[PDB]
Design an enzyme around this catalytic site. Sequence first.
Site, PDB file in Angstrom:
ATOM      1  N   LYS A  74       0.794  -1.234   0.000  1.00 46.85           N
ATOM      2  CA  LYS A  74       0.000   0.000   0.000  1.00 46.85           C
ATOM      3  C   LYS A  74       0.828   1.288   0.000  1.00 46.85           C
ATOM      4  O   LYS A  74       0.387   2.306  -0.503  1.00 46.85           O
ATOM      5  CB  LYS A  74      -0.978   0.023   1.156  1.00 46.85           C
ATOM      6  CG  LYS A  74      -2.068  -1.041   1.089  1.00 46.85           C
ATOM      7  CD  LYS A  74      -3.113  -0.626   0.060  1.00 46.85           C
ATOM      8  CE  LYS A  74      -4.385  -1.454   0.182  1.00 46.85           C
ATOM      9  NZ  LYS A  74      -4.260  -2.819  -0.404  1.00 46.85           N
ATOM     10  N   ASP A 108     -10.182   0.099  -0.254  1.00 49.16           N
ATOM     11  CA  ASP A 108      -9.940   1.152   0.752  1.00 49.16           C
ATOM     12  C   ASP A 108      -9.862   2.509   0.087  1.00 49.16           C
ATOM     13  O   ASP A 108      -8.954   3.276   0.402  1.00 49.16           O
ATOM     14  CB  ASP A 108      -8.644   0.912   1.552  1.00 49.16           C
ATOM     15  CG  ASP A 108      -8.751  -0.262   2.550  1.00 49.16           C
ATOM     16  OD1 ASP A 108      -9.859  -0.818   2.736  1.00 49.16           O
ATOM     17  OD2 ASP A 108      -7.724  -0.588   3.197  1.00 49.16           O
ATOM     18  N   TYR A 125     -14.982  -5.678  -0.922  1.00 51.08           N
ATOM     19  CA  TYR A 125     -14.126  -6.853  -0.959  1.00 51.08           C
ATOM     20  C   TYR A 125     -14.414  -7.870   0.134  1.00 51.08           C
ATOM     21  O   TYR A 125     -13.692  -8.864   0.248  1.00 51.08           O
ATOM     22  CB  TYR A 125     -12.670  -6.474  -0.906  1.00 51.08           C
ATOM     23  CG  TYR A 125     -12.224  -5.639   0.269  1.00 51.08           C
ATOM     24  CD1 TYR A 125     -11.895  -6.213   1.492  1.00 51.08           C
ATOM     25  CD2 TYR A 125     -12.013  -4.273   0.122  1.00 51.08           C
ATOM     26  CE1 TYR A 125     -11.443  -5.433   2.560  1.00 51.08           C
ATOM     27  CE2 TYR A 125     -11.550  -3.493   1.168  1.00 51.08           C
ATOM     28  CZ  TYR A 125     -11.267  -4.066   2.378  1.00 51.08           C
ATOM     29  OH  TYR A 125     -10.832  -3.247   3.410  1.00 51.08           O
ATOM     30  N   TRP A 130      -6.741 -13.630   1.860  1.00 50.85           N
ATOM     31  CA  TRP A 130      -6.956 -13.946   3.274  1.00 50.85           C
ATOM     32  C   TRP A 130      -6.120 -13.005   4.113  1.00 50.85           C
ATOM     33  O   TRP A 130      -4.892 -13.028   4.020  1.00 50.85           O
ATOM     34  CB  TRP A 130      -6.611 -15.401   3.580  1.00 50.85           C
ATOM     35  CG  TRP A 130      -6.985 -15.827   4.976  1.00 50.85           C
ATOM     36  CD1 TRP A 130      -8.170 -15.601   5.615  1.00 50.85           C
ATOM     37  CD2 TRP A 130      -6.191 -16.592   5.874  1.00 50.85           C
ATOM     38  NE1 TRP A 130      -8.169 -16.198   6.849  1.00 50.85           N
ATOM     39  CE2 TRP A 130      -6.940 -16.761   7.054  1.00 50.85           C
ATOM     40  CE3 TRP A 130      -4.898 -17.095   5.821  1.00 50.85           C
ATOM     41  CZ2 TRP A 130      -6.455 -17.470   8.163  1.00 50.85           C
ATOM     42  CZ3 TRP A 130      -4.397 -17.795   6.957  1.00 50.85           C
ATOM     43  CH2 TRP A 130      -5.182 -17.976   8.089  1.00 50.85           C
ATOM     44  N   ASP A 160      -1.112  -5.043  10.415  1.00 48.11           N
ATOM     45  CA  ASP A 160      -0.940  -3.630  10.177  1.00 48.11           C
ATOM     46  C   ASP A 160      -1.967  -2.763  10.909  1.00 48.11           C
ATOM     47  O   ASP A 160      -1.849  -1.571  10.942  1.00 48.11           O
ATOM     48  CB  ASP A 160      -0.874  -3.328   8.669  1.00 48.11           C
ATOM     49  CG  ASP A 160      -2.149  -3.664   7.896  1.00 48.11           C
ATOM     50  OD1 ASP A 160      -3.219  -3.847   8.523  1.00 48.11           O
ATOM     51  OD2 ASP A 160      -2.069  -3.681   6.629  1.00 48.11           O
ATOM     52  N   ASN A 162      -2.205 -12.282   2.832  1.00 46.39           N
ATOM     53  CA  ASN A 162      -1.652 -10.962   3.121  1.00 46.39           C
ATOM     54  C   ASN A 162      -0.913 -11.027   4.466  1.00 46.39           C
ATOM     55  O   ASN A 162      -1.526 -11.277   5.496  1.00 46.39           O
ATOM     56  CB  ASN A 162      -2.794  -9.955   3.188  1.00 46.39           C
ATOM     57  CG  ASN A 162      -2.323  -8.511   3.300  1.00 46.39           C
ATOM     58  OD1 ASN A 162      -1.211  -8.148   2.876  1.00 46.39           O
ATOM     59  ND2 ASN A 162      -3.206  -7.660   3.831  1.00 46.39           N
TER      60      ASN A 162
HETATM   61  C1  LIG Z   1     -11.039  -0.540   7.645  1.00 46.76           C
HETATM   62  C2  LIG Z   1     -10.442  -1.298   6.469  1.00 46.76           C
HETATM   63  C3  LIG Z   1      -9.150  -1.983   6.877  1.00 46.76           C
HETATM   64  C4  LIG Z   1      -8.224  -2.315   5.716  1.00 46.76           C
HETATM   65  C5  LIG Z   1      -8.011  -3.827   5.676  1.00 46.76           C
HETATM   66  N1  LIG Z   1      -7.010  -4.400   4.757  1.00 46.76           N
HETATM   67  C6  LIG Z   1      -6.580  -3.470   3.672  1.00 46.76           C
HETATM   68  C7  LIG Z   1      -7.411  -3.636   2.407  1.00 46.76           C
HETATM   69  C8  LIG Z   1      -7.799  -5.081   2.116  1.00 46.76           C
HETATM   70  O1  LIG Z   1      -8.278  -5.791   2.996  1.00 46.76           O
HETATM   71  N2  LIG Z   1      -7.704  -5.475   0.836  1.00 46.76           N
HETATM   72  C9  LIG Z   1      -8.364  -6.685   0.371  1.00 46.76           C
HETATM   73  C10 LIG Z   1      -5.113  -3.721   3.479  1.00 46.76           C
HETATM   74  O2  LIG Z   1      -4.827  -4.724   2.492  1.00 46.76           O
HETATM   75  C11 LIG Z   1      -4.692  -4.142   4.880  1.00 46.76           C
HETATM   76  O3  LIG Z   1      -3.444  -4.810   4.918  1.00 46.76           O
HETATM   77  C12 LIG Z   1      -5.811  -5.053   5.320  1.00 46.76           C
HETATM   78  C13 LIG Z   1      -5.775  -5.359   6.826  1.00 46.76           C
HETATM   79  O4  LIG Z   1      -5.716  -4.170   7.615  1.00 46.76           O
END
Ligand SMILES: CCCCCN1[C@H](CC(=O)NC)[C@H](O)[C@H](O)[C@H]1CO
Length: 677
Positions: free
Chosen positions: A163, A240, A279, A335, A341, A369
């Site tokens: 990101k 996001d 997603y 997944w 993070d 991930n």
């Molecule tokens: C409130 C939203 C939180 C974001 C959650 N995801 C993001 C987007 C994602 O899920 N893409 C499929 C990043 O990828 C990140 O690493 C992961 C976990 O924090």
Amino acid sequence: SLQPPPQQLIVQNKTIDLPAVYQLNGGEEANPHAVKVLKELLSGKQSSKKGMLISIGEKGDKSVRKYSRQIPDHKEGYYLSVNEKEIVLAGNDERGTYYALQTFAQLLKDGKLPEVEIKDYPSVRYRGVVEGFYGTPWSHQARLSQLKFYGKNKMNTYIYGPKDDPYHSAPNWRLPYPDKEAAQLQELVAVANENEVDFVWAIHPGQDIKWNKEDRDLLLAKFEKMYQLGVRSFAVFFDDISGEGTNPQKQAELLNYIDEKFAQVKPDINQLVMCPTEYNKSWSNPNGNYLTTLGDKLNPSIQIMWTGDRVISDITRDGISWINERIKRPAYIWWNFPVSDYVRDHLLLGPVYGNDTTIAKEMSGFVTNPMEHAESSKIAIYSVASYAWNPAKYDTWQTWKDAIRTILPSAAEELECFAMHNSDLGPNGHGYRREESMDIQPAAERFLKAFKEGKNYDKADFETLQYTFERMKESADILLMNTENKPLIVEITPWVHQFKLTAEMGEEVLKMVEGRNESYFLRKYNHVKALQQQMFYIDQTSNQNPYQPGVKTATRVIKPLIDRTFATVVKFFNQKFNAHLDATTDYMPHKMISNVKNLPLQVKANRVLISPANEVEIELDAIYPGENIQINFGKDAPGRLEISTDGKEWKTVDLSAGLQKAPVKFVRFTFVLTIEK
Ligand SMILES: CCCCCN1[C@H](CC(=O)NC)[C@H](O)[C@H](O)[C@H]1CO
Ligand SMILES: [Cl-]
């Protein structure tokens, strides 16, 4: 333990010596990367024609034409055989042959193979990792190690999408990588190719994309530059974001344009993948039509990613069914584990579990991930590889143990120890939790309930706790000095330090329980206090990221146990000796005696804050320049803000409120202060 476990395996009780003299059959025609693994394994051995036959090739090759009936007719399938007469290594395709060699290499022990016959292939077509997290992107060296790891574990997919890479996301997604970075990505691609991994370069243009020619052209030009660097698979992520970039018809039109003008024009593009804005199911708005619009318009060869029922979730049968009906194709799973993070003060080193093991036909792909900690992620990555390849035989715990033994053979038990107590996420906005310290959690809970009630704890429970703290100390100290995987140890060191302190603290608190005189008890009490101070220090000086700074370890079971035991036994000392020992369990250099109350202060970076709880005077340890004060909610009683250096003379401050670097030691209000370092 073969990992991933093959689909079908028959073993005879029969050792075969890796032959001093071999004849290579099909070395010239089989996958070059397979052949290269084989020559490595047959180093210091006579190749000749007075030697045991080694047959290697892909289906169609002359070398393996005998065995076409044995070779599974699946992509990436292979047949492998070892007996006293000959060895056979026959892929259904080139990647299959490479995968026969990865299994073969695992079978080799001492210089000797088991007599064995294997027919193998993956249950999920695309398997691997998406570097898709917020935080420091993986280093170039870490990525090169990852790709080798993926080849060994038959993961065929690496989706590049950190990101915080400015050339991945807004606004510099428009710009080519500069020379250095480009040369590095070129290398990554070559190394991926050598390890049979598809390097999938993602782009994340949605926050500022304009749905016009100019932005469409720049996106295509960027993709073209990546192709010139060797990239042969591509992804567009819309996760996001807000604004016009979230439009499903436009997203679908863009991806189909890329498909028809780029992916289908080139001779040799493999995967084309998109991450939708909705997603996961919780983010999907049933009042609109977003998912069914993508499903109906997006060309069907294009994959659509999905994290499950929630942002952080494990994949179920009903869940994959739900998404698949809407996108009219099998979901490509993203997944979100072990990604940390949003809980950056924890490592997530536990087993991989919770994903239904019968739904392989229902997914186009599965990728994890991971944490920004690359080496530490290999526990989860190894396990996902095993799961994805053969989910029907997926063994959560054995795979975890095997992963740890692979990553750190010199100190696997010490890593297991550390990992078993570093697996839960602690509380978080997603409500996603993992088990931790499962082994000791009944003895911990019995001990504490008894001690608290004034009943006799079971001795054995006490001893289990003692052993645990002892083992933790050994594991911490051993891990710190281990030189087998230096980059792993660099990643985890701060937590290893904290973990050792946690154990030392546990030991000293147990001595306070057992303690049988006042003087000895006091020595242990003083020591515990100092250890709490050391933990604070590490919490304030390591892993100082902007979101969840510091270092938390053994949080689910062990730190609560120790805290509550300390608090309890201090209470009993105080009753007994009519004393007033402080029973606070976390060091705090500042004070907050106050109306309305029992909330700990916390220090986070240059902030001092009152713990938010679910149902007023701060004194700092010195005078600092103030930046600001911000306050919120949760309150009955009907308030007036002031500031001071001596807590005698008070300047009222207005209201959020700037402080303009004015000296502060005291804040009063009948909740966060930021100060300057
Ligand atoms: C409130 C939203 C939180 C974001 C959650 N995801 C993001 C987007 C994602 O899920 N893409 C499929 C990043 O990828 C990140 O690493 C992961 C976990 O924090
Ligand atoms: Cl137990």
